[PDB]
Design an enzyme around this catalytic site. Structure first.
Site, mmCIF file in Angstrom:
data_model
loop_
_atom_site.group_PDB
_atom_site.id
_atom_site.type_symbol
_atom_site.label_atom_id
_atom_site.label_comp_id
_atom_site.label_asym_id
_atom_site.label_seq_id
_atom_site.Cartn_x
_atom_site.Cartn_y
_atom_site.Cartn_z
ATOM 1 N N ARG A 115 37.316 47.201 43.188
ATOM 2 C CA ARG A 115 36.414 46.076 42.960
ATOM 3 C C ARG A 115 35.088 46.546 42.377
ATOM 4 O O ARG A 115 34.420 45.799 41.652
ATOM 5 C CB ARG A 115 36.187 45.310 44.265
ATOM 6 C CG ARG A 115 37.179 44.183 44.513
ATOM 7 C CD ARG A 115 38.553 44.718 44.876
ATOM 8 N NE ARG A 115 39.552 43.660 44.973
ATOM 9 C CZ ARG A 115 40.849 43.864 45.188
ATOM 10 N NH1 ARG A 115 41.339 45.092 45.333
ATOM 11 N NH2 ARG A 115 41.671 42.827 45.256
ATOM 12 N N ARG A 169 48.113 38.969 47.554
ATOM 13 C CA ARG A 169 48.971 37.854 47.174
ATOM 14 C C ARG A 169 50.259 37.784 47.976
ATOM 15 O O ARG A 169 50.741 36.685 48.255
ATOM 16 C CB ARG A 169 49.312 37.944 45.683
ATOM 17 C CG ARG A 169 48.103 37.836 44.768
ATOM 18 C CD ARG A 169 48.499 37.946 43.305
ATOM 19 N NE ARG A 169 48.992 39.280 42.968
ATOM 20 C CZ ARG A 169 49.655 39.591 41.856
ATOM 21 N NH1 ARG A 169 49.923 38.670 40.934
ATOM 22 N NH2 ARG A 169 50.053 40.839 41.660
ATOM 23 N N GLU A 182 68.008 36.084 36.137
ATOM 24 C CA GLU A 182 67.885 35.988 34.686
ATOM 25 C C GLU A 182 68.952 35.074 34.101
ATOM 26 O O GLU A 182 68.703 34.373 33.112
ATOM 27 C CB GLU A 182 67.970 37.381 34.060
ATOM 28 C CG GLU A 182 66.848 38.322 34.475
ATOM 29 C CD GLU A 182 65.489 37.873 33.972
ATOM 30 O OE1 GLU A 182 65.391 37.477 32.792
ATOM 31 O OE2 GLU A 182 64.520 37.910 34.760
ATOM 32 N N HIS A 207 67.775 31.548 34.250
ATOM 33 C CA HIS A 207 66.853 31.199 33.173
ATOM 34 C C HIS A 207 67.610 30.769 31.923
ATOM 35 O O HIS A 207 67.165 29.874 31.196
ATOM 36 C CB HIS A 207 65.941 32.383 32.856
ATOM 37 C CG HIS A 207 64.839 32.583 33.849
ATOM 38 N ND1 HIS A 207 63.744 31.750 33.925
ATOM 39 C CD2 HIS A 207 64.658 33.529 34.802
ATOM 40 C CE1 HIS A 207 62.939 32.169 34.884
ATOM 41 N NE2 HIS A 207 63.470 33.247 35.432
ATOM 42 N N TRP A 231 33.778 33.103 46.930
ATOM 43 C CA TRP A 231 35.115 33.679 47.028
ATOM 44 C C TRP A 231 35.342 34.295 48.403
ATOM 45 O O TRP A 231 36.424 34.161 48.987
ATOM 46 C CB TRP A 231 35.315 34.721 45.929
ATOM 47 C CG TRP A 231 36.680 35.325 45.920
ATOM 48 C CD1 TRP A 231 36.994 36.637 46.108
ATOM 49 C CD2 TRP A 231 37.920 34.641 45.709
ATOM 50 N NE1 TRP A 231 38.354 36.816 46.024
ATOM 51 C CE2 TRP A 231 38.946 35.604 45.783
ATOM 52 C CE3 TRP A 231 38.263 33.307 45.466
ATOM 53 C CZ2 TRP A 231 40.290 35.276 45.623
ATOM 54 C CZ3 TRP A 231 39.596 32.985 45.309
ATOM 55 C CH2 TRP A 231 40.594 33.965 45.386
ATOM 56 N N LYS A 279 37.940 32.935 51.337
ATOM 57 C CA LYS A 279 38.974 33.806 51.885
ATOM 58 C C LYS A 279 39.039 33.703 53.403
ATOM 59 O O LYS A 279 40.120 33.817 53.993
ATOM 60 C CB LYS A 279 38.722 35.250 51.453
ATOM 61 C CG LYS A 279 39.192 35.548 50.037
ATOM 62 C CD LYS A 279 38.725 36.912 49.555
ATOM 63 C CE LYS A 279 39.435 38.044 50.276
ATOM 64 N NZ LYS A 279 39.352 39.315 49.508
ATOM 65 N N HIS A 312 46.829 37.828 35.829
ATOM 66 C CA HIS A 312 46.883 36.490 35.253
ATOM 67 C C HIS A 312 45.509 36.009 34.804
ATOM 68 O O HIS A 312 45.390 35.374 33.750
ATOM 69 C CB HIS A 312 47.477 35.509 36.262
ATOM 70 C CG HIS A 312 48.886 35.825 36.655
ATOM 71 N ND1 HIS A 312 49.213 36.908 37.443
ATOM 72 C CD2 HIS A 312 50.053 35.201 36.370
ATOM 73 C CE1 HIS A 312 50.521 36.937 37.625
ATOM 74 N NE2 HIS A 312 51.055 35.913 36.984
#
EC number: 3.4.17.23
Lengths: 194, 597
Positions: free
Chosen positions: B151, B255, B357, B360, B459, B463, B487
């Site tokens: 960070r 995550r 896959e 998909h 943030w 959290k 992302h």
């Protein structure tokens, strides 16, 4: 016509005449060198027992999915704007996949077809005009754009195409019974002389 | 005659020309991924710029057809894709600067590394070094350095870059008739002009908000179980009532708890389902795994694959001279040409990845007959959600026992079910509120509710409240944690993960009902059920020609996201988590931190 080196475009479909000979229709049925074969009104094995006044063969290449449009009473881009058949069509249609022959890297641009037309075609009618399809009141002035479109477009016959997009060498065998006498009758059987 | 013929003929012209142009870019990408070369990467970019240039020039006539007095949904959806200008609304200076910000943020994120304070010569990069520190290593000191220094080195530098990213992007979205770029991401699910199926952009904020509160009864119980188990490993830093440290979550971004399964094993003595060895004894290979995987798709009642599908697909890395991309990726090369790239090994991880896959492909192959502009998914959730439901059912031992990989003598009980079931909640339940947290923070940053100087403060506050996570070292306003995500830096939307996860169980419950399966959904298996594949293909074939809300009403029984099928999947897990939380506190307490004194 079943094994021609080059086929005419769909909107510029060619026609060959067949008369004054003996026509063996069983060779194609038993050759197993085609992808689809269907006769309307008569069986393929029985055509040898039938002579006709005139016989025409309309040759062209279409995609796999477009083969359904070639039949009596159908409609679509190919049926209405490129090549139409009458409702009482009693001929035959043969189709053979030519992906290993006609496919080209980047598409075979020599085979083209019409997408739009000011009016629907008649049975066995041809139209190779380059007129711009006008939808609005404004004139196109020889260029497409707003309410204007160039009706002819090329086919995407690439070697990577699927069954629905690959090229298929199609020939439509039409028969004709007129007042004039016959000209081409099938092969008759023979045996030894007792 | 009428104006309607203009759009119908215009889209037909685009649908013919955009089709072959797009496939040339799609095909060039296949060549590059199959053989990484300077020639293929250039033709990949050249084909991409060529097709993108065609999209821009076609936007001129697309805007000459107002859609106010138009009632044709087909005409509205197709033209709206081209009528939108997007980045073209701003000058070349702003559009190019945005690309300069994105490329710089990606390089700073990719080249990020942390050096050992006790060994400065030893430094670990983002992948595979620092990812293994948070995933595999259980050392408290190593995880803290990888988290905190990341960070400081990567998070701090991306803060001023994320500022111009949000500012420049908001001008682009606002010029395209949006409230912000956050609302621009919400426009994916936009629906208008269909009675009984309309959907506004802002409704996504309420759906993720409403579904989040319904997840709290399940997430709060799992968080206490994970905190309790991690408390035993780190009792000198974790309290039984407080929050979980952020550097002990299992990744460099907080995550997933999937890497914490070794620390949160429900029953370490009981066995689990794994057919990796079973495939090796049966002389299986990459082709047989793909071939036998297709038998599942055929048995459930979905369309089969073509001959060129398996012949032209890639199964392994063809040498280092022509090294290919081994990432699992489904490809739509066009003209019925579908293929998959994967370096498949003999293991259960690749067994389910093969079904993922292949799912998909079934998505794309269904609506392949639609127009080119409509030959795409209705949304991002529908694209990726369908892939998981096919792999999860295959992961059920009922299918493995039928094919003959898992022995029939394998004992199944409630004990082993929790080992499998709880392992998923660490991935699903341990990630669902995190996506709602991050996207809610980003959506507030795009709108401008959170000033630029209050990114880290809000943030950190979010959290503690939403997820119950606390940092290992306090960060001042100069830090920016979520900017260090893949992302966020590469301009992607992470809300699709939240929508994909809930849609996965929604479609699962719909097909489990079609398969006549009773009980919780984690024991569900749709194998040999022809009604399962038939009901799904009717939804896959819609593409984006109809509203996505309609596709849910006739399949899963709703129009928005819902937590109903989630608890049905984790039904016995909620009971198990309750007994384990007897010696702990459900939820979290925001007053505790690992650096407390």
């Amino acid at each position: 016509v079943f094994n021609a080196t080059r086929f005419a475009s769909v909107y510029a479909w060619n026609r060959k005449r067949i008369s004054n000979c003996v026509a063996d229709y069983s060779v194609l049925y038993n050759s197993a060198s085609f992808s689809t074969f269907k006769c309307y009104g008569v069986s393929p094995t029985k055509l040898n027992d039938l002579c006709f006044t005139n016989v025409y063969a309309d040759s062209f290449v279409i995609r796999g999915d477009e083969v359904r449009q070639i039949a009596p009473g159908q409609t679509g881009k190919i049926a209405d704007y490129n090549y139409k058949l009458p409702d009482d069509f009693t001929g035959c249609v043969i189709a053979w996949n030519s992906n290993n022959l006609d496919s080209k890297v980047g598409g075979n641009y020599n085979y083209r077809y019409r997408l739009f037309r000011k009016s629907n075609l008649k049975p066995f009618e041809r139209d190779i005009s380059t007129e711009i399809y006008q939808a609005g009141s404004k004139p196109c002035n020889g260029v497409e754009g707003f309410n204007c479109y160039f009706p002819l477009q090329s086919y995407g016959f690439q070697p990577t195409n699927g069954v629905g997009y690959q090229p298929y060498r199609v020939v439509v065998l039409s028969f004709e019974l007129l007042h004039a006498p016959a000209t081409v009758c099938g092969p008759k059987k023979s045996t030894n002389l007792v | 005659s009428t104006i309607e013929e203009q759009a119908k003929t215009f889209l037909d012209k685009f649908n013919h020309e955009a089709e072959d142009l797009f496939y040339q870019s799609s095909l060039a990408s296949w060549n590059y991924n199959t053989n990484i070369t300077e020639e293929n990467v250039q033709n990949m970019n050249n084909a991409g710029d060529k097709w993108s240039a065609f999209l821009k020039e076609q936007s001129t006539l697309a805007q000459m057809y107002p859609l106010q007095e138009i009632q044709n949904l087909t005409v509205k959806l197709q033209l709206q894709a081209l009528q939108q200008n997007g980045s073209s609304v701003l000058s070349e200076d702003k559009s190019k600067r945005l690309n300069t910000i994105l490329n710089t943020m990606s390089t700073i994120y990719s080249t990020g590394k942390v050096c050992n304070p006790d060994n400065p010569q030893e430094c670990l990069l983002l992948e595979p070094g620092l990812n293994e520190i948070m995933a595999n290593s259980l050392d408290y000191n190593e995880r803290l350095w990888a988290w905190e220094s990341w960070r400081s080195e990567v998070g701090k530098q991306l803060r001023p870059l994320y500022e111009e990213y949000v500012v420049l992007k908001n001008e682009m979205a606002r010029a395209n008739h949006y409230e912000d770029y956050g609302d621009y991401w919400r426009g994916d699910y936009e629906v208008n002009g269909v009675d009984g199926y309309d959907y506004s952009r802002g409704q996504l904020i309420e759906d993720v908000e409403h579904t989040f509160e319904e997840i709290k009864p399940l997430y709060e119980h799992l968080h206490a179980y994970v905190r309790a188990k991690l408390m035993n490993a780190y009792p000198s830093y974790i309290s039984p009532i407080g929050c979980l440290p952020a550097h002990l979550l299992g990744d460099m971004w907080g995550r997933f708890w999937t890497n914490l399964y070794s620390l949160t094993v429900p029953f370490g003595q009981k066995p689990n389902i794994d057919v990796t060895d079973a495939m090796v004894d049966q002389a299986w290979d990459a082709q047989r795994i793909f071939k036998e995987a297709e038998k599942f798709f055929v048995s459930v009642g979905l369309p089969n694959m073509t001959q060129g599908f398996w012949e032209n697909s890639m199964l392994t890395d063809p040498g280092n001279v022509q090294k290919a991309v081994c990432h699992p990726t489904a490809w739509d090369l066009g003209k019925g040409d579908f293929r998959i790239l994967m370096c498949t090994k003999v293991t259960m991880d690749d067994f389910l990845t093969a079904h993922h896959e292949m799912g998909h492909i079934q998505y794309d192959m269904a609506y392949a007959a639609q127009p080119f502009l409509l030959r795409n998914g209705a949304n991002e959730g529908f694209h990726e959600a369908v892939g998981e439901i096919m792999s999860l059912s295959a992961a059920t031992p009922k299918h493995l026992k039928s094919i003959g990989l898992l022995s029939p003598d394998f004992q199944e009980d409630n004990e082993t079910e929790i080992n499998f079931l709880l392992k998923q909640a660490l991935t699903i339940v341990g990630t669902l509120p995190f996506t709602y947290m991050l996207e809610k923070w980003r959506w507030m940053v795009f709108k401008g509710e959170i000033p630029k100087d209050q990114w880290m403060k809000k943030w950190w506050e979010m959290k503690r409240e939403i997820v119950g996570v606390v940092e290992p070292v306090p960060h001042d306003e100069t830090y920016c944690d979520p900017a260090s995500l893949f992302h966020v830096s590469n301009d992607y939307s992470f809300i699709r993960y939240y929508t994909r996860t809930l849609y996965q169980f929604q479609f699962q419950e719909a097909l489990c009902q079609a398969a006549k399966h009773e009980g919780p959904l984690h024991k569900c298996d749709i194998s040999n059920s022809t009604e399962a594949g038939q009901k799904l293909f009717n939804m896959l074939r819609l593409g984006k020609s109809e509203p996505w809300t309609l596709a849910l009403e006739n399949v899963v029984g709703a129009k928005n996201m819902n937590v109903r099928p989630l608890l049905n999947y984790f039904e016995p897990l909620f009971t198990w988590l309750k007994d384990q939380n007897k010696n702990s506190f459900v939820g979290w307490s925001t007053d505790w931190s690992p650096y407390a004194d």
